[PDB]
Amino acid sequence: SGFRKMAFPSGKVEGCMVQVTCGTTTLNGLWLDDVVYCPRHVICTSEDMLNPNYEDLLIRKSNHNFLVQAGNVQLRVIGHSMQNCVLKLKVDTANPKTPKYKFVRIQPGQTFSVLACYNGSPSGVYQCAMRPNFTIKGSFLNGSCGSVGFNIDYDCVSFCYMHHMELPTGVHAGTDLEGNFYGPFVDRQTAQAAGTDTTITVNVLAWLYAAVINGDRWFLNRFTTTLNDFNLVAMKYNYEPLTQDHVDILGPLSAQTGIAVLDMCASLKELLQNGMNGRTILGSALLEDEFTPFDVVRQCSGVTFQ
Amino acid sequence: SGFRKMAFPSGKVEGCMVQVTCGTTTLNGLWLDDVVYCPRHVICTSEDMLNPNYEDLLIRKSNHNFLVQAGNVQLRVIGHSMQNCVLKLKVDTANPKTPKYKFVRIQPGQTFSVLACYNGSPSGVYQCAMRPNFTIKGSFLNGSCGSVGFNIDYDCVSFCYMHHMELPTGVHAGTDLEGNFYGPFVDRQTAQAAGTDTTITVNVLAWLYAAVINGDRWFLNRFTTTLNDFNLVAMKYNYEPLTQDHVDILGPLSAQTGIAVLDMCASLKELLQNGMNGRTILGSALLEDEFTPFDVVRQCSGVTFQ
Ligand SMILES: *C(=N)[C@@H](NC(=O)[C@@H]1[C@@H]2[C@H](CN1C(=O)[C@@H](NC(=O)C(F)(F)F)C(C)(C)C)C2(C)C)c1cncc2cc(F)ccc12
Ligand SMILES: *C(=N)[C@@H](NC(=O)[C@@H]1[C@@H]2[C@H](CN1C(=O)[C@@H](NC(=O)C(F)(F)F)C(C)(C)C)C2(C)C)c1cncc2cc(F)ccc12
């Protein structure tokens, strides 16, 4: 038992991280087969980054303008190109540690592990959700651009996120590995801002089920509610609507606990209207929304990866 | 910016995990050089584990009673011995992935990363503190015994914890890597129980400093307090006493924020007496005590490991 924000083991990703230098800018790259992926704003200078023009900036660069450090070993760049907001640096060595991988784009509401990196050196790993407003509440300092987010499905790494920038509220914005931003953000220094967020309802319900599995039951009640009357209540407290597909996804968790999905919604309703009255759930005094139903089945059942 | 419970990159530990089978019991082992370390209760049966007698049980075993799986590769056990509560299985192959390592025993109040493992296969990584009562609030299911806790200091893995057992409150107990239990727990099936805990005061203060660095300031005040009058207040709310050495350890964080340690104690005093009045700190509605001053300097400054 127990319940933690748990990241995937990071070793397979650690073996892909490298340092990319262009000019006086150093950031992180992802080395898979003979390509290094990194944020294209590496080619910008301080005054470039105000309103930059990346096709112009890139034609003025040469392969030798890019220094790639794999540990204490240098890699010749033998080619370069831009794909959307990432750079693809072709190098003369295939990464012998290349795992089986995929480039996937995730949905707001889904979770992933982030291997925070500086100078190509992994610093720490932690779990994030893609917020409904397409930001992530990460932990990132200067030099962390190019760090990636990922999931692991048995032996295959599905890369979903590359870090580009921190917004003024202290949340983080980036791209999928094809260089397309999550949300309405651009790799320029404008006045862009997150935009209003919502709470991920289906995830909160999944986490209430994790609590019941781990013995917290005080918030249960005999009451019930209909999907419509619940979705009424979610809308007032700035929660996302719950769909029938969310109810279906919660099926396994409902069956394991014996608590019908709509009954747990009645509990959530009461928790939203009454607060928690000084009690806690899974060590939290807030309703937690960054565990998916998958995540809960994962720790409360115990699946591994090889 | 941002602040997360962040684990160390786990790759160096992942390359050490193996599966140990003896009879019908399977658990995890740690393979360093030519030795596999694992909980000695692997040699027990269901009826053995009531009041077991390990020297007797071990002399009845042979090297071939121990099946060791390193991935899909078997390792001959060529020797076995007991050291306190762990088994040392000498195998015929040195682990080529053996990192630089140390076996260290930690203090209640310190933190570490846990690589949860099943059947020798890493499942997830997360951050824990050693509670004042020598338990850890982990996340562990059947088969997770033998999973290890660790810290990384540049390139060297300091192993501090091996998982043995779950107590009835759902917290976890185990040993250091020399086989000596943390706290008053035994690898028998008795009625043993955690025993009363306290909140780790110095860690809460470190986390308030992390909040100030990340822009939460509402809990600040001009007030001050003396160490004695604060330690008075800690004792009522079941917080550990704060020592002058704790104040010294908080020095760097005090200097970076401009908030004297004893001033932050006055803030903590008010937070304990008044609650938080519906506000949050670093996304928490509770005072968090599982980040050390080191941990805070680590994310709010950005140190890596190679
Ligand atoms: C990566 N190592 C670094 N990010 C950047 O350098 C990006 C990149 C240009 C500036 N920038 C920013 O993150 C800035 N933010 C913004 O322009 C905006 F708020 F998002 F609009 C800023 C002001 C330096 C934070 C471009 C936007 C393309 C990076 C990554 N994570 C965190 C930080 C924190 C920092 F203090 C500095 C740099 C960070
Ligand atoms: C490891 N794979 C497993 N732990 C054990 O098998 C240990 C080990 C014997 C029983 N045990 C326990 O953890 C039991 N707990 C206790 O006896 C006590 F409460 F701590 F006193 C119990 C009742 C099965 C949980 C010895 C004590 C030496 C393990 C590890 N982590 C979590 C779990 C959860 C489980 F449900 C079962 C086994 C677990």
**Three-state secondary structure string covering chain A:** CCCCCCECCCHHHHCCEEEEEECCEEEEEEEECCEEEEEHHHHCCCCCCCCCCHHHHHHCCCHHHEEEEECCEEECEEEEEEECCEEEEEECCCCCCCCCEEECCCCCCCEEEEEEEECCEEEEEEEEEECCCCCECCCCCCCCCCCEEEEEECCEEEEEEEEEEECCCCCEEEECCCCCECCCCCCCCCCCCCCCCCECHHHHHHHHHHHHHCCCCCCCCCCCCCHHHHHHHHHHCCECCCCHHHHHHCHHHHHHHCCCHHHHHHHHHHHHHHCCCCCCECCECCCCCCCCHHHHHHHHHHCCCC
Q: Does A4 touch chain B (CB under 8 A)?
A: yes
Q: Sign of the CA dihedral A105, A109, A110, A115? A: positive
Ligand 1 centroid to Cα of residue B152, in Å, is 28
Asked if residue A8 lies in contact with residue A114, where contact means CB atoms within 8 angstroms, the answer is no
Is ligand 1 within 6 A of the CB of residue A140?
Answer: yes
Of the candidates A205, A288, A273, A186, the residue with the CA atom closest to the CA atom of residue A236: A273
Q: Sign of the CA dihedral B98, B102, B103, B107? A: negative
Q: How far apart are CA B303 and CA B291, in angstroms?
A: 15
Query: What are B21's strand-pairing partners?
Result: B26, B67
- Tell the residue number behind the tokens 């991988």, with chain if given: A101
Phi and psi angles of residue B198, each rounded to the nearest 5 degrees, phi first:
-130, 165
Ligand 1 centroid to Cα of residue A134, in Å, is 16
Q: Å from B187 to nearest chain A CA? A: 18
List the residue whose alpha carbon is closest to atom 16 of ligand 2. Answer: B189
* Binary contact (A124, B7; C-beta < 8 A): yes
Residues of A with a catalytic annotation lie at 41, 145
- Tell the residue number behind the tokens 């790259």, with chain if given: A29
Q: Which residues have a Cβ under 8 Å from the Cβ of A179 and sit 6 or more positions away?
A: A40, A82, A83, A84, A85, A86
Ligand 2 centroid to Cα of residue B13, in Å, is 23
Cα dihedral B189→B159→B294→A171 (10° resolution): -90
Cα atoms in the 13 Å half-sphere on the side-chain side of B262: 11
Asked if residue A106 lies in contact with residue A161, where contact means CB atoms within 8 angstroms, the answer is yes
Phi and psi angles of residue B5, each rounded to the nearest 5 degrees, phi first:
-70, 110
Cα dihedral B291→B297→B301→B302 (10° resolution): -60
Q: How far apart are CA B126 and CA B114, in angstroms?
A: 5
Asked if residue B287 lies in contact with residue B231, where contact means CB atoms within 8 angstroms, the answer is no
Interface test with B, best of A3, A10, A281 (most B CBs within 10 A): A10
Q: Which residues have a Cβ under 8 Å from the Cβ of B287 and sit 6 or more positions away?
A: B199, B204, B207, B268, B271, B272, B281
Q: How far apart are CA A200 and CA B26, in angstroms?
A: 38
Asked if residue B149 lies in contact with residue B113, where contact means CB atoms within 8 angstroms, the answer is yes
* Residue B187 Cα distances to A241, B17, B18, angstroms: 49, 22, 21
Q: How far apart are CA B153 and CA B149, in angstroms?
A: 14
Q: How far apart are CA A154 and CA A167, in angstroms?
A: 34
Asked if residue B109 lies in contact with residue B129, where contact means CB atoms within 8 angstroms, the answer is yes
Of the candidates A5, A13, A7, the residue with the CA atom closest to the CA atom of residue A122: A13
What is the β-pairing status of strands A66-70 and B101-103? unpaired
- Two tokens at A129? 């959700």
Cα A119–chain centre separation = 21
Best residue among A165, A169, A181, A189 to mutate for probing ligand 1, ranked by most atoms within 8 Å of CB: A165
Ligand located closest to B42 CA: 2
Q: How far apart are CA A167 and CA A116, in angstroms?
A: 17
Q: How far apart are CA A60 and CA A37, in angstroms?
A: 19
Q: Which CATH class is domain B15-99?
A: mainly beta
Chain B from 74 to 93: CB within 8 A of any A CB: none
- Two tokens at B61? 């075993």
Residue A247: Cβ within 10 Å count: 17
Q: How far apart are CA A160 and CA A298, in angstroms?
A: 19
In angstroms, what is the resolution?
1.9
| Domain B1-14+100-197 homologous superfamily, CATH | Trypsin-like serine proteases (2.40.10.10)
Q: How far apart are CA A173 and CA A161, in angstroms?
A: 9
Q: Sign of the CA dihedral A135, A136, A138, A142? A: negative
Nearest CA in chain B to A167: B1
Q: Does A218 touch chain B (CB under 8 A)?
A: no
- Tell the residue number behind the tokens 């209430």, with chain if given: A208
Asked if residue B238 lies in contact with residue B198, where contact means CB atoms within 8 angstroms, the answer is yes
Q: How was this structure determined?
A: X-ray
Q: Does B283 touch chain A (CB under 8 A)?
A: yes
Query: Which amino acid, one-letter code, is at A68?
Result: V
Asked if residue A203 lies in contact with residue A210, where contact means CB atoms within 8 angstroms, the answer is no
Spell B15-51 as b/e; 16+ CB within 10 A means b.
bbbbbbbbeebbbbbbbbebbbbbbbbbbbeeebeee
Cα B278–chain centre separation = 31
- Tell the residue number behind the tokens 């806690």, with chain if given: A280
CA terminus-to-terminus distance, chain A: 23
List the residue whose alpha carbon is closest to atom 11 of ligand 2. Answer: B165
- Tell the residue number behind the tokens 């409904």, with chain if given: A132
* Residue A81 Cα distances to A33, A78, A88, A161, angstroms: 16, 11, 5, 19
CATH number of A198-301: 1.10.1840.10
Which residue is catalytic, options B22, B44, B145, B160?
Answer: B145
Q: Which residues have a Cβ under 8 Å from the Cβ of A60 and sit 6 or more positions away?
A: none
Query: Which amino acid, one-letter code, is at A49?
Result: M
Query: Which amino acid, one-letter code, is at A246?
Result: H
Q: Å from B3 to nearest chain A CA? A: 5
Q: How far apart are CA B177 and CA B7, in angstroms?
A: 20
Looking at the CA of residue B191, tell me the nearest atom of ligand 2: 21
Q: How far apart are CA B306 and CA B299, in angstroms?
A: 16
Q: SS3 letters for chain B?
A: CCCCCCECCCHHHHCCEEEEEECCEEEEEEEECCEEEEEHHHHCCCCCCCCCCHHHHHHCCCHHHEEEEECCEEECEEEEEEECCEEEEEECCCCCCCCCEEECCCCCCCEEEEEEEECCEEEEEEEEEECCCCCECCCCCCCCCCCEEEEEECCEEEEEEEEEEECCCCCEEEECCCCCECCCCCCCCCCCCCCCCCECHHHHHHHHHHHHHCCCCCCCCCCCCCHHHHHHHHHHCCECCCCHHHHHHCHHHHHHHCCCHHHHHHHHHHHHHHCCCCCCECCECCCCCCCCHHHHHHHHHHCCCC
As to burial, measured by CB atoms within 10 angstroms (0-12 exposed, 13-18 middle, 19+ buried), residue B72 is exposed
Asked if residue B27 lies in contact with residue B162, where contact means CB atoms within 8 angstroms, the answer is no
Cα A52–chain centre separation = 27
Nearest CA in chain A to B279: A286
Phi and psi angles of residue A197, each rounded to the nearest 5 degrees, phi first:
-105, 165
* Residue A167 Cα distances to A136, A293, B201, angstroms: 10, 29, 32
* Residue B248 Cα distances to A255, B213, B242, B254, angstroms: 53, 19, 11, 9
- Two tokens at A6? 């748990």
The answer to whether A15-99 and A198-301 have equal CATH topology is no
Looking at the CA of residue B173, tell me the nearest atom of ligand 2: 20
Ligand located closest to B85 CA: 2
Q: How far apart are CA A177 and CA A36, in angstroms?
A: 11
Q: Sign of the CA dihedral A247, A251, A255, A256? A: negative
Cα A86–chain centre separation = 17
Q: Determine the Cα angle at B227 with ends B224 and B230, to 5°.
A: 70
Phi and psi angles of residue A154, each rounded to the nearest 5 degrees, phi first:
60, -100
Spell B113-145 as b/e; 16+ CB within 10 A means b.
bbbbbbbbbbbbbbbbbbbbbbbbbbbbeebbb
Ligand 1 centroid to Cα of residue B275, in Å, is 35
Q: Does A167 touch chain B (CB under 8 A)?
A: no
Residue A78: Cβ within 10 Å count: 12
* Residue A278 Cα distances to B122, B279, B286, angstroms: 37, 14, 10
Of the candidates B44, B38, B14, the residue with the CA atom closest to the CA atom of residue B177: B38
Phi and psi angles of residue B132, each rounded to the nearest 5 degrees, phi first:
-55, -30
B300 is a catalytic site residue: no
Give the length of chain A. 306
Cα B12–chain centre separation = 17
Asked if residue B250 lies in contact with residue B191, where contact means CB atoms within 8 angstroms, the answer is no
Residue A60: Cβ within 10 Å count: 8
Ligand 1 centroid to Cα of residue A170, in Å, is 10
Of the candidates B41, B77, B44, the residue with the CA atom closest to the CA atom of residue B62: B77
- Two tokens at A37? 């992926």
Query: Which amino acid, one-letter code, is at B67?
Result: L
- Two tokens at A239? 């929660």
Q: How far apart are CA A108 and CA A154, in angstroms?
A: 23
Query: Which amino acid, one-letter code, is at B294?
Result: F
Asked if residue A292 lies in contact with residue A204, where contact means CB atoms within 8 angstroms, the answer is no
- Two tokens at A273? 């209207």
Q: How far apart are CA B227 and CA B245, in angstroms?
A: 12
Where are chain B's structural domains? Answer: 1-14+100-197, 15-99, 198-301
